Amino acid sequence: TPYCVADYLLDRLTDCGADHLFGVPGDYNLQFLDHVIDSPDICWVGCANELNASYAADGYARCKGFAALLTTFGVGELSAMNGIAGSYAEHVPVLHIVGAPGTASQQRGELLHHTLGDGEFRHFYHMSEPITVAQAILTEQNACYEIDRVLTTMLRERRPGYLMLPADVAKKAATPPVNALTLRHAHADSACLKAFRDAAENRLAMSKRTALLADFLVLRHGLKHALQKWVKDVPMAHATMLMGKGIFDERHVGFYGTYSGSASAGAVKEAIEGADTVLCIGTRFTDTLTAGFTHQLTPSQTIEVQPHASRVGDVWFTGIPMLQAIETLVELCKQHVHDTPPDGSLTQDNFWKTLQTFIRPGDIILADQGTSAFGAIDLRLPADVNFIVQPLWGSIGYTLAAAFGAQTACPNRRVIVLTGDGAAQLTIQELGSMLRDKQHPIILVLNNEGYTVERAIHGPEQRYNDIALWNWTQIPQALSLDPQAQCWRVSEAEQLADVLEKVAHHERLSLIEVMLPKADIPPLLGAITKALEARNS
Amino acid sequence: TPYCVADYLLDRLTDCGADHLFGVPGDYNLQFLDHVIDSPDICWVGCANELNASYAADGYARCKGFAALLTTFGVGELSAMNGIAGSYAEHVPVLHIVGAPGTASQQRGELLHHTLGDGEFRHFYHMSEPITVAQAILTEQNACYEIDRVLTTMLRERRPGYLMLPADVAKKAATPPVNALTLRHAHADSACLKAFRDAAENRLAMSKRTALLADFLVLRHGLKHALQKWVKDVPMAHATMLMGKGIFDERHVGFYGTYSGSASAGAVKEAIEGADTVLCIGTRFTDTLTAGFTHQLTPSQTIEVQPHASRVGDVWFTGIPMLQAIETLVELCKQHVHDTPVPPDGSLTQDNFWKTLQTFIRPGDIILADQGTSAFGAIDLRLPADVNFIVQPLWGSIGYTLAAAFGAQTACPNRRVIVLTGDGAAQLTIQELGSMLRDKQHPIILVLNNEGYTVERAIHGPEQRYNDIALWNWTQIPQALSLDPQAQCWRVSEAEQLADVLEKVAHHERLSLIEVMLPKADIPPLLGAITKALEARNS
Ligand SMILES: Cc1ncc(C[n+]2csc(CCOP(=O)(O)OP(=O)(O)O)c2C)c(N)n1
Ligand SMILES: Cc1ncc(C[n+]2csc(CCOP(=O)(O)OP(=O)(O)O)c2C)c(N)n1
Ligand SMILES: [Mg+2]
Ligand SMILES: [Mg+2]
């Protein structure tokens, strides 16, 4: 087993923080897979299909900062395309490795399985170009520096990359590197830095009250601790939006709730929108995050920091790393910013209140699109919570499979899965992977007997919002010969509270089927369901 | 409810042969969905996910000649891409309708859900371009003629098309067409047809024994009955390959078995490879179909017919419709081809499994088999008359079969559907079993359970953990995916038990799921030839 390109790729992957590889085998990637199996540094995680694997890698990367997916040419990689696209949309660095037919076969234009039957082998590489920041077709002549380039760009942009690995290229000789792959820390030109620093300083110097609004780009670029220490050293009103929830301990002084535009609690609206200066850090004002773009924040009111550029009022300063922009603003703030800030029947209301008493520091909480995410936005999170939600891409089914990737990343943390009954149908077979791997998530299936969110938007009585009605508490014993799962169906707040006490220490996988009313929607959902379909009558 | 673009599209769908629409709802397609529900001609079929929906539409199109898929912008269409890709690879005309944000929203570049967050709304349209023969972004100014163009091109090529339907465009006023959309039959220039006819005749006039090899393009372009009539009116040696199985009644004189290159039965090799002229009709000699390109057929030995061009020896004749090429060859064969073709154990094995199933299949059956030890065992089934045999060996996506079966049963509620899937394959699309049960379908699902990924076990790393899977409780799945399953499940390990169960479910009064327990390292005959010349490649 002489060291080869397959080994070099695995060495560089682990350098980037991935200790696991998700995917599904196929004949074009089997020989590469042998190197994954034999490696002591990377653990193969076989998934039940490729879409789920790409969701799982995404959740993993939201826990470890990096992840990798392996599929086979054509059928595998195209099955995962929606996963990689969602990682691109939400800035999740997932590496898609595609095992491919050998280069000689490709050059001869053979009529191989997993092709369109036209002798062409680059169609799927090109279709992946819009949803990655870097891609390469690996050859014997470029392998090691193309691997390094794509991984490096992935680290810089915190977004997916793609590598086509022909089976023969994987076996070509390589050399172990002495140094791990690192992304050299960027620094703005000092005159550029001064221009931004001066404009921010002069703006902040005239602020009576300043507020801090941070979101998901802070998470992706590893700046959570910097944002927490900032508000600790400089107390002020602060918030996140739905995507970046979990950046802050929401019990801390100065936090009043998650900002969601006009749907915000009044205290949040006043704390953020009422400040005469609002620092917008790693923020993206999407339609869901702002209740249909009804946020009230003007350019002259705001300072914003993006990964490579920052803005003060009307002026953009480009080529400033977000790390340096934040550091600049922390020092400047230090220089001013002074004066500190049980029922019966289950409803959406008492469910989220019951869940509120249950969550604890260390929890990993995932919520899918639908009433799950828009109820969970109102959870007041304690310290050290990883809150994983996908409101920009918005692919239902993401959450159950992402939970499998997240638990793989963090076996000793408690994983709470909040999924609608409709969402869980799209990726149910990854429940079988959790049981196979002896994971102990707490899966809460919000069963309101259909697509309730779509009922809110349009056609509440229309049969297209109906689904097959599953027997949720029997699924683990169908997807395992020895599930060792604890299942309950609950319809009362007291039953849910009692069950939550029983599963608090997650010694087994648990599935809680939560019986909820069909037309019941959380507060934010009612607010977001007033201008959603406003475009078309 | 004035007639609008949404209604015009649905009317054109019916014209093309589709009576159902598969997919998953989303806020960007909901108002269009209201027109699907209200339509008396199109029945909405909600699916458990978009990948499965696209597989189901594919199976439906292989029964009805056309199918349609509805997804939502971004998250929906990208989940279905592998299905549309397989429909393109295997020439299945599935129409992908993508409900999209309204045009003004797109023009403003808003940060909308199901986008990449860049204000760009044409990324996914562009990514679908390689896997469709036609696509359009529908506007108020082009809607009805772009709809007709894309559907017409799909009918001519028998391949997928794509339409992005912004929500506002769908409500724009339209007019019901008086005439159905039709694919006018193309005609070769008569001098061009003559050139092919003369060359084919000169070859056939000197051929001592001529054989006929027809495959899947015959099925896609509606020429099954023509090929059956050809071999009835002109007896001669004939075969298909795996993809085209079902073109012929395989009990009829002159049929000796399915051709698969060096893995063929000796009678087939002699009948096909031993002929001095082999008419190759709608054929694609893929690696799977030829046991690793070990077929022995030379250019001067062959005449081939593709959808728009035909070849005699080394010379190609282009701009000839496959239909007219076939009509020409039928005439020439009637002139020059004057032949009379020479005409239960205990424990379950691969061999006695297929022998048991052989006695069970009947005319009218729809038989679907997935990649693995299913399709390559099913290749040896001797099909009676009027069987629809659905296999996907060129694209080769496992999981396709269970979801395609749901589409096939939807198309043909009164036909018996037999699903041959491995335990590994069924895991990728299992949630569509729930759709089968919801809709009270009665397929016969045989899960070939040998406790892992046997097909790759054979090719590489048989003891490697990546060929293992989670072990499911197959006979409990219907009761998990339904509150009241109209199902019966059995687990069988003996040939006689399988025979007894199959006899019980012959009239398919309920969904039946049969977990068939097979040995871990047991592979069918044809795979043994395909497993040696597969790791003969990239190693
Ligand atoms: C992959 C994908 N397909 C379709 C949609 C459209 N969609 C948005 S919400 C929804 C229904 C979600 O239902 P469920 O999980 O039961 O949620 P709830 O009833 O709590 O709203 C659908 C189909 C989507 N977001 N993602
Ligand atoms: C979508 C997809 N992913 C991966 C592959 C590669 N592949 C080919 S066969 C196979 C395993 C098939 O397992 P099973 O259905 O149990 O078959 P059997 O054990 O009878 O061979 C896999 C993963 C594929 N063809 N399609
Ligand atoms: Mg629901
Ligand atoms: Mg198997």
* Residue A37 burial class via C-beta count within 10 angstroms: exposed 0-12, middle 13-18, buried 19 and up: middle
Assess whether the C-beta atom of B394 lies below 6 angstroms from ligand 1.
Answer: no
CB A421 within 8 A of CB A470: yes
Closest to B390 (Cα-Cα) out of B400, A498, B380:
B400
Distance CA A419, CA B254 (A): 58
Distance CA A367, CA A391 (A): 10
DSSP A106-165: HHTT---TTS-SSS---HHHHHTGGG-SEEEE--TTTHHHHHHHHHHHHHHHT--EEEEE
Query: What is the signed CA dihedral for A29, A35, A39, A45, rounded to 10 degrees?
Result: 20
CB A51 within 8 A of CB A436: no
CB B368 within 8 A of CB B19: no
Nearest CB partner across the interface for B286, out of A78, A113, A436: A113
Tokens of A240: 């996140």
Tokens of B467: 């060929």
Instruction: Give the phi and the psi of residue B260 in degrees, each rounded to 5.
Output: -145, 50
- Sign of CA pseudo-dihedral A536, B4, B5, B7: positive
Q: Which residues pair with A212 in a beta bridge?
A: A238, A279
Closest to B386 (Cα-Cα) out of B367, B401, B405, B372:
B367
Assess whether the C-beta atom of A223 lies below 6 angstroms from ligand 1.
Answer: no
The secondary structure of residue A266, as a DSSP letter, is H
Gap sites in chain B (C to N > 2.5 Å), preceding residue numbers? 343
Instruction: Give the phi and the psi of residue A352 in degrees, each rounded to 5.
Output: -65, -35
Distance CA B19, CA B10 (A): 9
Which stretches within B171-245 are classed as H helix?
190-205, 217-220, 224-233
CB B240 within 8 A of CB B217: no
Q: Taking the CB of residue B270, how many other CB atoms lie within 10 A of it? A: 15
Give the three-class secondary structure for A406: helix
Helix axes B322-336, B190-205, angle to 10 degrees: 30
The secondary structure of residue A48, as a DSSP letter, is S
Q: Where are the beta strands (DSSP E) in B94-170?
A: 94-100, 134-137, 161-166
Closest ligand to Cα A425: 1
Q: Which residues pair with B96 in a beta bridge?
A: B69, B162
Tokens of A204: 């902040």
Give the three-class secondary structure for B366: strand
Distance CA B241, CA B246 (A): 10
Q: Looking at CA atoms only, how far is residue A1 from chain B in angstroms?
A: 13
Q: Which helix (H) or strand (E) holds B70?
A: strand B67-72
CB A371 within 8 A of CB A348: yes
Distance CA B247, CA B96 (A): 27
The amino acid present at A158, given as its one-letter code, is R
Q: Which residues 6+ apart lie within 8 Å of B484 measured at CB?
A: none
**Terminal C-alpha separation, chain A:** 65
Distance CA B224, CA B424 (A): 33
CATH architecture of A5-170: 3-Layer(aba) Sandwich (3.40)
Query: What is the signed CA dihedral for A433, A436, A438, A439, rounded to 10 degrees?
Result: 10
- The preferred substitution site among A393, A396, A449, A469 for testing ligand 1, maximizing ligand atoms within 8 Å of CB, is A396
Nearest CB partner across the interface for A471, out of B102, B435, B479: B479
Q: Where are the beta strands (DSSP E) in B88-145?
A: 94-100, 134-137
Q: Looking at CA atoms only, how far is residue A297 from chain B in angstroms?
A: 16
Instruction: Give the phi and the psi of residue A345 in degrees, each rounded to 5.
Output: -65, 145
Tokens of A445: 């299936």
The amino acid present at B28, given as its one-letter code, is Y
Let me know if B114 is a catalytic residue.
Answer: yes
The secondary structure of residue A272, as a DSSP letter, is I
Q: Which residues 6+ apart lie within 8 Å of B385 measured at CB?
A: B249, B251, B363
Q: Which helix (H) or strand (E) holds B9?
A: helix B5-15
* Residue B461 burial class via C-beta count within 10 angstroms: exposed 0-12, middle 13-18, buried 19 and up: middle
Distance CA B157, CA B149 (A): 12
Distance CA B406, CA B408 (A): 6
The H helix count followed by the E strand count for chain A is: 23, 18
How many CA atoms lie within 13 Å of A456's alpha carbon, on the beta-carbon side? 22
CB A377 within 8 A of CB A245: yes
Distance CA A427, CA A175 (A): 40
Put simply, the answer to whether B431 touches A454 (Cβ < 8 Å) is no
Instruction: Give the phi and the psi of residue A132 in degrees, each rounded to 5.
Output: -140, 155
Tokens of B378: 């099913």
Give the three-class secondary structure for A367: strand
Q: Which helix (H) or strand (E) holds B78?
A: helix B75-79
Q: Which residues pair with A137 in a beta bridge?
A: A164
CB B211 within 8 A of CB B271: yes
Distance CA B249, CA B252 (A): 6
CB A171 within 8 A of CB A3: no
Q: Which residues of A touch B75 (CB under 8 A)?
A: 82, 86, 393-396
The secondary structure of residue B255, as a DSSP letter, is B
The secondary structure of residue B416, as a DSSP letter, is -
Give the three-class secondary structure for A210: strand
The domain A190-334 is placed in CATH, from the list 3.40.50.1220, 1.10.1370.30, 3.40.50.720, 3.10.450.50, at 3.40.50.1220
A/B interface, count of CB pairs below 8 Å: 285
- The preferred substitution site among B368, B420, B453, B526 for testing ligand 2, maximizing ligand atoms within 8 Å of CB, is B453
The per-residue b/e assignment along A86-121, b for 16 or more CB within 10 angstroms, e otherwise, is bbbbbbbbbbbbbbbbbbebbeeebbbbbbbbeeeb
CB A350 within 8 A of CB A517: no
Domain extents in chain A: 5-170, 190-334, 348-528
Assign domain B350-530 to its CATH superfamily: Thiamin diphosphate (ThDP)-binding fold, Pyr/PP domains (3.40.50.970)
Q: Which residues 6+ apart lie within 8 Å of A198 measured at CB?
A: none
Let me know if A276 is a catalytic residue.
Answer: no
Distance of CA A253 to CAs A114, A235, A326, A384, B336, Å?
57, 8, 21, 16, 95
CB A311 within 8 A of CB A325: no
Distance CA A22, CA A13 (A): 13
Tokens of A378: 């109102």
CB B215 within 8 A of CB B243: yes
Q: Which residues 6+ apart lie within 8 Å of B50 measured at CB?
A: B23, B24, B69, B71, B76, B77, B79, B80, B83
Closest to A445 (Cα-Cα) out of A368, A528, A350, A336:
A368
Q: Which helix (H) or strand (E) holds A483?
A: none
Closest to B51 (Cα-Cα) out of A28, A97, A82:
A82
Specify the experimental method.
X-ray
Q: Looking at CA atoms only, how far is residue A176 from chain B in angstroms?
A: 22
Q: Which helix (H) or strand (E) holds B456?
A: helix B454-459
Q: Which residues does a 6 A CB cutoff place in the pocket of ligand 2? A: A 24-26, 72, 75-76, 79; B 370-374, 396-399, 422-425, 448, 450, 453-456
Give the three-class secondary structure for B112: coil
Distance of CA A459 to CAs A455, A519, B439, B528, Å?
6, 12, 21, 54
Assess whether the C-beta atom of A454 lies below 6 angstroms from ligand 1.
Answer: yes
Distance CA A272, CA A195 (A): 26
Identify the residue whose tokens are 């995410």. Answer: A373
Tokens of B457: 């076990």
Tokens of A49: 């299909």
Catalytic residue among B82, B449, B450, B467: B450
CB B250 within 8 A of CB B384: yes
CB B265 within 8 A of CB B281: no
CB B17 within 8 A of CB B66: yes
Put simply, the answer to whether B395 touches A127 (Cβ < 8 Å) is no
Nearest CB partner across the interface for A392, out of B89, B117, B287: B117
CB A314 within 8 A of CB A290: no
* Atom 11 of ligand 1, residue of closest alpha carbon: A451
Give the three-class secondary structure for B391: strand
Distance CA B57, CA B40 (A): 19
Centroid of chain to Cα B231: 24
Distance of CA A275 to CAs A298, A341, A451, B14, Å?
11, 12, 39, 59
Instruction: Give the phi and the psi of residue B477 in degrees, each rounded to 5.
Output: -65, -45
Q: Taking the CB of residue A175, how many other CB atoms lie within 10 A of it? A: 10
The secondary structure of residue B521, as a DSSP letter, is T
Helix axes A50-64, A81-89, angle to 10 degrees: 30
CA angle, B176 then B180 then B184, to 5°: 140
The amino acid present at B505, given as its one-letter code, is V
CB B124 within 8 A of CB A84: no
Query: What is the signed CA dihedral for A13, A15, A18, A22, rounded to 10 degrees?
Result: 20
Distance of CA B443 to CAs A115, A357, B54, B67, B504, Å?
30, 47, 19, 20, 13
* Atom 16 of ligand 2, residue of closest alpha carbon: B424
Distance CA B473, CA A134 (A): 42
CB B367 within 8 A of CB B381: yes
The H helix count followed by the E strand count for chain B is: 23, 18
Distance CA B262, CA B283 (A): 17
The amino acid present at B11, given as its one-letter code, is D
- Resolution for this experimental structure (Å): 1.9
* Nearest-atom index, ligand 1, CA of B25: 23
Class at the top of the CATH hierarchy for domain A348-528: alpha beta
The reply to whether A190-334 and A348-528 are identical in fold is yes
Q: Locate the chain B residue with the closest alpha carbon to A38.
A: B464
CB B213 within 8 A of CB B242: no
Distance CA A234, CA A450 (A): 46
* Nearest-atom index, ligand 2, CA of A79: 1
The domain B190-336 is placed in CATH, from the list 1.25.40.20, 3.30.43.10, 3.40.50.1220, 3.20.20.70, at 3.40.50.1220
Residues whose beta carbons lie less than 5 angstroms from ion ligand 4: B 422-424, 450, 454
Q: Looking at CA atoms only, how far is residue A149 from chain B in angstroms?
A: 23
Distance CA B377, CA B422 (A): 11
Distance CA B389, CA B244 (A): 8
Nearest CB partner across the interface for B461, out of A34, A293, A457: A34
Give the three-class secondary structure for A382: coil
Q: A309-312 and A302-305: which strand pairing?
A: antiparallel
Let me know if B450 is a catalytic residue.
Answer: yes
- Sign of CA pseudo-dihedral B535, B376, B368, A49: negative
DSSP A275-324: SSEEEEES----TTTTTTT-----TTTEEEE-SSEEEETTEEEES--HHH
Distance of CA A182 to CAs A92, A223, A377, B509, Å?
18, 18, 36, 63
CB B391 within 8 A of CB B245: yes
Distance of CA A126 to CAs A121, A139, B128, Å?
10, 17, 11
Q: Which residues 6+ apart lie within 8 Å of B298 measured at CB?
A: none
Q: Which residues of B touch A536 (CB under 8 A)?
A: 31, 102, 167-168, 171
Q: Sheet containing A302-305: which strands, arranged edge to edge?
A: A238-240, A210-214, A277-281, A302-305, A309-312, A315-318
Q: B487-492 and B511-517: which strand pairing?
A: parallel
Q: Which residues 6+ apart lie within 8 Å of B470 measured at CB?
A: A48, A432, A433, A435, A436, A479, A480, B427
